[PDB]
Amino acid sequence: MQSITAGQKVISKHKNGAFYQCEVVRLTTETFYEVNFDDGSFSDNLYPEDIVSQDCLEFGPPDEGEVVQVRWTDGQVYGAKFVASHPIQMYQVEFEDGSQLVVKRDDVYTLDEELP
């Protein structure tokens, strides 16, 4: 399948929920953290700044297995153990209204292809 490059016109969903033509402004790598909470539940999509026991933006990820504290979706702090750091290629897109999103490869379509 096709690689997508910066400056290409593509089709993707706007924040309102409908597909429009947009432009790829830049390619980015986003780094997600994976953790096992103390109750045994698992998260695969934490950001580095969500670790509140150490400064991961300045010093990089925890060691595999390391005890951490996490600021969660409810705004509370929970104990966890660090599992892994998972980098993903993403695509910053811009619509005619000036709005922007950062999205996964599977959310972008070429002008020539059938939707969805």
PDB file of C-alpha atoms in Angstrom:
ATOM      1  CA  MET A   1       0.000   0.000   0.000  1.00  0.00           C
ATOM      2  CA  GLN A   2       0.904   3.603  -0.587  1.00  0.00           C
ATOM      3  CA  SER A   3       3.150   5.720   1.593  1.00  0.00           C
ATOM      4  CA  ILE A   4       1.756   9.208   2.361  1.00  0.00           C
ATOM      5  CA  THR A   5       4.074  12.266   2.137  1.00  0.00           C
ATOM      6  CA  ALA A   6       4.085  15.802   3.575  1.00  0.00           C
ATOM      7  CA  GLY A   7       2.349  18.287   1.220  1.00  0.00           C
ATOM      8  CA  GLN A   8      -0.040  15.606  -0.240  1.00  0.00           C
ATOM      9  CA  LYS A   9      -3.791  16.284  -0.555  1.00  0.00           C
ATOM     10  CA  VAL A  10      -5.665  13.333   1.042  1.00  0.00           C
ATOM     11  CA  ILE A  11      -9.169  12.577   2.437  1.00  0.00           C
ATOM     12  CA  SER A  12      -9.812  12.214   6.215  1.00  0.00           C
ATOM     13  CA  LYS A  13     -12.569  12.828   8.820  1.00  0.00           C
ATOM     14  CA  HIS A  14     -12.871  16.379  10.238  1.00  0.00           C
ATOM     15  CA  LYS A  15     -13.717  16.856  13.943  1.00  0.00           C
ATOM     16  CA  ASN A  16     -17.469  17.200  12.939  1.00  0.00           C
ATOM     17  CA  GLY A  17     -17.413  13.509  11.795  1.00  0.00           C
ATOM     18  CA  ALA A  18     -17.540  13.840   7.952  1.00  0.00           C
ATOM     19  CA  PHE A  19     -14.815  13.160   5.346  1.00  0.00           C
ATOM     20  CA  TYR A  20     -13.280  16.173   3.496  1.00  0.00           C
ATOM     21  CA  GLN A  21     -10.168  16.837   1.444  1.00  0.00           C
ATOM     22  CA  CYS A  22      -7.265  17.917   3.700  1.00  0.00           C
ATOM     23  CA  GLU A  23      -3.504  18.462   3.367  1.00  0.00           C
ATOM     24  CA  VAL A  24      -0.705  16.596   5.209  1.00  0.00           C
ATOM     25  CA  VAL A  25       1.280  19.390   6.977  1.00  0.00           C
ATOM     26  CA  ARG A  26       3.948  17.107   8.519  1.00  0.00           C
ATOM     27  CA  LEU A  27       4.805  13.502   9.515  1.00  0.00           C
ATOM     28  CA  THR A  28       5.394  12.973  13.259  1.00  0.00           C
ATOM     29  CA  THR A  29       6.331  10.110  15.623  1.00  0.00           C
ATOM     30  CA  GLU A  30       4.181   9.944  18.787  1.00  0.00           C
ATOM     31  CA  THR A  31       5.495   7.907  21.749  1.00  0.00           C
ATOM     32  CA  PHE A  32       2.872   6.076  23.834  1.00  0.00           C
ATOM     33  CA  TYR A  33       3.481   4.314  27.193  1.00  0.00           C
ATOM     34  CA  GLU A  34       1.973   0.996  28.274  1.00  0.00           C
ATOM     35  CA  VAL A  35       1.358   0.168  31.988  1.00  0.00           C
ATOM     36  CA  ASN A  36      -0.241  -2.518  34.203  1.00  0.00           C
ATOM     37  CA  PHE A  37      -2.226  -0.843  37.017  1.00  0.00           C
ATOM     38  CA  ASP A  38      -2.208  -2.309  40.564  1.00  0.00           C
ATOM     39  CA  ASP A  39      -5.730  -3.806  39.999  1.00  0.00           C
ATOM     40  CA  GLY A  40      -4.403  -5.723  36.916  1.00  0.00           C
ATOM     41  CA  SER A  41      -6.053  -3.495  34.233  1.00  0.00           C
ATOM     42  CA  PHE A  42      -3.857  -2.447  31.247  1.00  0.00           C
ATOM     43  CA  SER A  43      -3.406   0.884  29.359  1.00  0.00           C
ATOM     44  CA  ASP A  44      -1.703   1.058  25.932  1.00  0.00           C
ATOM     45  CA  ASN A  45      -1.883   4.807  25.147  1.00  0.00           C
ATOM     46  CA  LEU A  46      -0.535   6.950  28.009  1.00  0.00           C
ATOM     47  CA  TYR A  47       1.532  10.003  27.189  1.00  0.00           C
ATOM     48  CA  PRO A  48       4.983  10.377  28.882  1.00  0.00           C
ATOM     49  CA  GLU A  49       3.799  13.424  30.901  1.00  0.00           C
ATOM     50  CA  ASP A  50       1.063  11.226  32.537  1.00  0.00           C
ATOM     51  CA  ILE A  51       3.827   9.525  34.607  1.00  0.00           C
ATOM     52  CA  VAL A  52       3.900  11.659  37.799  1.00  0.00           C
ATOM     53  CA  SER A  53       6.540   9.703  39.842  1.00  0.00           C
ATOM     54  CA  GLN A  54       9.446  10.790  37.533  1.00  0.00           C
ATOM     55  CA  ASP A  55      10.074  13.326  34.663  1.00  0.00           C
ATOM     56  CA  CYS A  56       9.921  11.148  31.520  1.00  0.00           C
ATOM     57  CA  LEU A  57       9.947  14.139  29.073  1.00  0.00           C
ATOM     58  CA  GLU A  58      13.378  15.114  30.463  1.00  0.00           C
ATOM     59  CA  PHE A  59      14.923  11.691  31.337  1.00  0.00           C
ATOM     60  CA  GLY A  60      13.145   9.176  29.060  1.00  0.00           C
ATOM     61  CA  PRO A  61      11.048   6.100  29.922  1.00  0.00           C
ATOM     62  CA  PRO A  62      10.965   4.115  33.197  1.00  0.00           C
ATOM     63  CA  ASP A  63      12.792   0.776  33.364  1.00  0.00           C
ATOM     64  CA  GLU A  64      10.769  -2.293  32.316  1.00  0.00           C
ATOM     65  CA  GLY A  65       8.803  -3.432  35.384  1.00  0.00           C
ATOM     66  CA  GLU A  66       9.444  -0.211  37.381  1.00  0.00           C
ATOM     67  CA  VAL A  67       6.834   0.966  39.895  1.00  0.00           C
ATOM     68  CA  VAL A  68       5.243   4.267  38.791  1.00  0.00           C
ATOM     69  CA  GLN A  69       2.333   6.611  39.603  1.00  0.00           C
ATOM     70  CA  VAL A  70      -0.017   7.692  36.783  1.00  0.00           C
ATOM     71  CA  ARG A  71      -2.431  10.624  36.419  1.00  0.00           C
ATOM     72  CA  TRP A  72      -5.454   8.945  34.794  1.00  0.00           C
ATOM     73  CA  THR A  73      -8.531   9.944  32.680  1.00  0.00           C
ATOM     74  CA  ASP A  74     -10.537  10.638  35.866  1.00  0.00           C
ATOM     75  CA  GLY A  75      -7.900  13.169  37.114  1.00  0.00           C
ATOM     76  CA  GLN A  76      -6.875  10.794  40.008  1.00  0.00           C
ATOM     77  CA  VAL A  77      -3.484   9.127  40.675  1.00  0.00           C
ATOM     78  CA  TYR A  78      -3.001   5.342  40.574  1.00  0.00           C
ATOM     79  CA  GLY A  79      -0.103   2.953  41.164  1.00  0.00           C
ATOM     80  CA  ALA A  80       1.178   0.928  38.200  1.00  0.00           C
ATOM     81  CA  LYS A  81       4.140  -0.990  36.728  1.00  0.00           C
ATOM     82  CA  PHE A  82       5.764   0.174  33.460  1.00  0.00           C
ATOM     83  CA  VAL A  83       5.515  -2.289  30.540  1.00  0.00           C
ATOM     84  CA  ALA A  84       6.877  -0.678  27.326  1.00  0.00           C
ATOM     85  CA  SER A  85       7.172   2.447  25.108  1.00  0.00           C
ATOM     86  CA  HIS A  86       5.470   2.142  21.626  1.00  0.00           C
ATOM     87  CA  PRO A  87       6.331   4.768  18.956  1.00  0.00           C
ATOM     88  CA  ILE A  88       3.806   5.210  16.103  1.00  0.00           C
ATOM     89  CA  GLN A  89       4.096   7.149  12.833  1.00  0.00           C
ATOM     90  CA  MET A  90       1.322   9.739  12.603  1.00  0.00           C
ATOM     91  CA  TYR A  91       0.098  12.437  10.166  1.00  0.00           C
ATOM     92  CA  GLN A  92      -0.785  16.067  11.003  1.00  0.00           C
ATOM     93  CA  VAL A  93      -3.574  17.150   8.626  1.00  0.00           C
ATOM     94  CA  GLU A  94      -5.148  20.559   7.919  1.00  0.00           C
ATOM     95  CA  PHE A  95      -8.698  21.269   6.595  1.00  0.00           C
ATOM     96  CA  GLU A  96      -9.880  24.242   4.516  1.00  0.00           C
ATOM     97  CA  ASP A  97     -11.292  25.873   7.741  1.00  0.00           C
ATOM     98  CA  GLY A  98      -7.771  25.846   9.314  1.00  0.00           C
ATOM     99  CA  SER A  99      -8.620  23.066  11.865  1.00  0.00           C
ATOM    100  CA  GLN A 100      -6.006  20.340  12.444  1.00  0.00           C
ATOM    101  CA  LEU A 101      -5.805  16.732  13.635  1.00  0.00           C
ATOM    102  CA  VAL A 102      -3.011  14.212  14.248  1.00  0.00           C
ATOM    103  CA  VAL A 103      -4.088  10.815  12.909  1.00  0.00           C
ATOM    104  CA  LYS A 104      -3.080   7.198  12.187  1.00  0.00           C
ATOM    105  CA  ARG A 105      -2.273   5.849   8.717  1.00  0.00           C
ATOM    106  CA  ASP A 106      -5.566   3.870   8.516  1.00  0.00           C
ATOM    107  CA  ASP A 107      -7.515   7.152   8.942  1.00  0.00           C
ATOM    108  CA  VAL A 108      -6.047   8.668   5.727  1.00  0.00           C
ATOM    109  CA  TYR A 109      -7.266   7.905   2.183  1.00  0.00           C
ATOM    110  CA  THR A 110      -5.827   8.861  -1.235  1.00  0.00           C
ATOM    111  CA  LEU A 111      -7.948  10.867  -3.747  1.00  0.00           C
ATOM    112  CA  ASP A 112      -8.152   7.816  -6.071  1.00  0.00           C
ATOM    113  CA  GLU A 113      -9.559   5.316  -3.523  1.00  0.00           C
ATOM    114  CA  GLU A 114     -13.105   4.290  -2.515  1.00  0.00           C
ATOM    115  CA  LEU A 115     -14.412   5.439   0.880  1.00  0.00           C
ATOM    116  CA  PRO A 116     -14.662   3.863   3.434  1.00  0.00           C
TER     117      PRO A 116
END
